Amino acid sequence: KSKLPKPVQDLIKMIFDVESMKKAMVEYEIDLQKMPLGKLSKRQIQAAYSILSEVQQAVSQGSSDSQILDLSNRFYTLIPHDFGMKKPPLLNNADSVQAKAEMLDNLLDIEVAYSLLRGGSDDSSKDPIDVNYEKLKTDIKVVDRDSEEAEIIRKYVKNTHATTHNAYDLEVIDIFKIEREGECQRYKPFKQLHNRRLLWHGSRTTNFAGILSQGLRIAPPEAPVTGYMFGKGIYFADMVSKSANYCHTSQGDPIGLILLGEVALGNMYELKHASHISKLPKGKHSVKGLGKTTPDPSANISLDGVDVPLGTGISSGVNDTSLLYNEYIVYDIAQVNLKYLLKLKFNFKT
């Protein structure tokens, strides 16, 4: 039987859960009859992303209703949905294009998980757990509840989470220390960059096999840009509040996963409203979206040069921002070093 700790074994079961894959699809109104799990394909997804982009273009120019009707139909031909009656919605706004793309990113990470899950030898020599654990190519270790690491973390979560957006309370079930294959070398260079911070990154749990296996990625060129306030990059937050909302949990499934990554920010190009960057000003190596709420600066703590902004949570200098919280975007995957993964339980106040 498996050598991995219990909590780790349970983490594997979680991310490699097939029923979760199906649930995510059915929750997208996807006909699993026509578009079964094993039918998903990278290529089918690039195509869908490209249709999505065309829609945005059509939406921006003000295309002639029929062009938006064929683009809409082209999308539902690619991604088979079930409505029965009423008919499929028209994709005629930045709003629908953002939802559909978000769904494609998720569906793509699910294709990756089902594909890893299937690839490799299925010889019962070793148990499913240890095997599927190998597939992630990252070293996972439990962090003891009573370690300074855990304490630092729990405090970061409590301080940066407030009664304001208190729709739920957060319980840290497990925290893991993680080191992906090749994150030690790829980062070593970018580490020679100042302003290194330990930030949050929340994502749906169905995306975790794909995130650990391939790392955080930047949207493909065919992806529409609507939805990326500061362009195609990797986003983080310094308040568990902002990230936790991307875990998409509910009273039905109240437990989610969230990452803590060390990101070498360099000089930050500060902005208050959306701006499609990607091409930064000289001397800038990251973008910082200024929010209304910041963790209290005085309480910031350190580590090997990695600042942990675990300050409680206060109003910031500028409120004339379109942001409730801060955002941090880097446009190079090498500027990211994932260090911890946390299993969180959401207790909704409802």
Applying CB under 6 A, does 202 fall inside the site for ligand 3GN? yes
218: burial class by Cβ within 10 Å (0-12, 13-18, 19+)? middle
**Coil, helix or strand at residue 222:** coil
CB of 248 to ligand 3GN, least distance (A): 10
Q: Which is nearer to ligand 3GN, 14 or 324 (CB)?
A: 324
What is the phi/psi pair of residue 183, to 5°?
-95, -15
Considering only residues 109, 183, 238, 327, which one is a binding residue for ligand 3GN as defined by CB under 6 A?
Answer: 327
Neighbours of 304 (CB within 10 A): 7
Considering only residues 16, 236, 331, 346, which one is a binding residue for ligand 3GN as defined by CB under 6 A?
Answer: 236
Report the alpha-carbon distance of residue 120 to residue 45 in Å, rounded. Answer: 23
Considering only residues 207, 243, 286, 337, which one is a binding residue for ligand 3GN as defined by CB under 6 A?
Answer: 243
- To the question of whether residue 197 is assigned a binding role by annotation, the answer is no
Considering only residues 242, 248, 288, 343, which one is a binding residue for ligand 3GN as defined by CB under 6 A?
Answer: 242
Neighbours of 61 (CB within 10 A): 9
Applying CB under 6 A, does 331 fall inside the site for ligand 3GN? no
Residues facing residue 260 across a β-bridge: 200, 340
**Coil, helix or strand at residue 150:** helix
Report the alpha-carbon distance of residue 3 to residue 235 in Å, rounded. Answer: 35
Positions in 35-94 near ligand 3GN (CB under 6 A):
none
Residues facing residue 196 across a β-bridge: 264, 306
User: How many binding residues for ligand 3GN (CB under 6 A)?
Assistant: 13
DSSP 316-347: -S---SS-SS-EEEES-GGGEEEEEEEEEEEE
Neighbours of 63 (CB within 10 A): 16
Report the alpha-carbon distance of residue 28 to residue 23 in Å, rounded. Answer: 9
CB of 320 to ligand 3GN, least distance (A): 19
Report the alpha-carbon distance of residue 226 to residue 58 in Å, rounded. Answer: 13
- To the question of whether residue 201 is assigned a binding role by annotation, the answer is yes
**Coil, helix or strand at residue 103:** helix
Applying CB under 6 A, does 201 fall inside the site for ligand 3GN? yes
Applying CB under 6 A, does 205 fall inside the site for ligand 3GN? no
Applying CB under 6 A, does 249 fall inside the site for ligand 3GN? no
Which residues are part of the catalytic machinery?
327
Q: Which is nearer to ligand 3GN, 190 or 235 (CB)?
A: 235
CB of 332 to ligand 3GN, least distance (A): 16
Applying CB under 6 A, does 246 fall inside the site for ligand 3GN? yes
Applying CB under 6 A, does 237 fall inside the site for ligand 3GN? yes
Applying CB under 6 A, does 200 fall inside the site for ligand 3GN? yes
Contacting residues toward ligand 3GN, per CB under 6 A: 200-203, 227-228, 235-237, 242-243, 246, 327
Annotated binding site for NAD(+): 201-203, 210, 217, 243
Annotated binding site: 201-203, 210, 217, 243
